[PDB]
Amino acid sequence: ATIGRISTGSKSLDKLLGGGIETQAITEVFGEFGSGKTQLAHTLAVMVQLPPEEGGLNGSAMYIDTENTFRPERLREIAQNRGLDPDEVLDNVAYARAFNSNHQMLLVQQAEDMIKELLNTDRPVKLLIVDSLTSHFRSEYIGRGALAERQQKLAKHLADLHRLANLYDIAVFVTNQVGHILAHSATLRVYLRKGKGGKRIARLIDAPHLPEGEAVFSITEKGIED
Ligand SMILES: COc1ccc([C@H](C)NC(=O)[C@@H]2CCCN2C(=O)CNC(=O)c2ccc3ccccc3n2)cc1
Ligand SMILES: [Ca+2]
């Protein structure tokens, strides 16, 4: 199936990604709090809803929140500033708070039911966000020799998400707090950092196949833009 791409709202970041966030892939965005990873998740939850000439996939979004990061008023602001109806935009986002890592796994199985339901409609699910993927796994699988079991549980969770992305042609977008020696299984990893007082900077990590460079974007009333 053709890969679909969702615009991030920034021409700079879209160029770095090769057009935007891809379906049939897991894109992992990592950085410090406020680096723009949650702002990007919120922007994408709106952008995916737009028609393709506007950078979307005429789709709906599903958002798994592990750290109480979801702000429905922020989605409303992005939608209104982009010429969209905020209530209709919120109606196209399914939201769930994951209480722990095991509940986070169950939520992914429930996501598949909604995805299957809407697959052949005029507005299928096209984006699944997990913000953040690792927080519960890092707090639960902790201490002496916990690395092996945590990485096995994370590897399994990521395999389930890769399956939803590939089987249903959806973009899976996950965020992560930031160690350097651990393995990662995302299709694409993006490092975000706070820039020159106002900007945010993005770099691709371990992607020889994709272009060398860094993107610069801003957090605005429209979510993410140049
Ligand atoms: C004014 O404050 C607001 C606060 C939040 C919202 C959000 C956008 N909308 C909702 O909360 C809506 C309205 C009430 C129920 N509801 C759900 O989305 C219920 N969700 C689910 O049943 C569900 C199930 C499995 C899932 C697996 C993965 C990800 C998400 C999943 N969501 C809107 C306004
Ligand atoms: Ca952020």
Author numbering: 108 to 285, 302 to 349
The article reads:
BRCA2 acts during HDR to control the recombination enzyme, RAD51, a eukaryal protein evolutionarily conserved as RecA in eubacteria, and RADA in archaea. RAD51 executes the DNA strand exchange reactions that lead to HDR by assembling, in a sequential and highly regulated manner, as helical nucleoprotein filaments on single-stranded (ss) or double-stranded (ds) DNA substrates. Structure-based approaches to identify modulators of the BRCA2–RAD51 interaction have been impeded by the lack of a monomeric unliganded form of HsRAD51. We have previously described the development of molecular surrogate systems for RAD51 based on an archaeal ortholog, RadA from Pyrococcus furiosus (Moschetti et al., 2016). In brief, we were able to produce the C-terminal ATPase domain of RadA as a stable monomeric protein, and by careful mutagenesis, to convert the surface of the protein to resemble human RAD51, with the ability to bind the BRCA2 BRC4 repeat with high affinity.
Compound 5 was too insoluble in aqueous media to profile in cell-based assays. Accordingly, we made modifications designed to increase polarity, while avoiding the introduction of further hydrogen-bond donors likely to reduce permeability. We replaced the naphthyl ring with a quinoline, converted the Ala residue into a Gly, and introduced a 4-methoxy substituent on the right-hand phenyl ring, leading to 6. Compound 6 has a clogP of 2.76 and an improved FP Kd of 8.0 μM (n = 22) against ChimRAD51. Two independent X-ray structures of 6 demonstrated that this compound was still bound to the FxxA site with the quinoline accessing the Phe pocket in a similar orientation to the naphthyl in compound 4 albeit with a shifted binding mode discussed in more detail below. We attribute this to the truncation of the His residue back to a Gly, a change that can be tracked in the X-ray structures of intermediates from the optimization bound to HumRadA22F (data not shown).
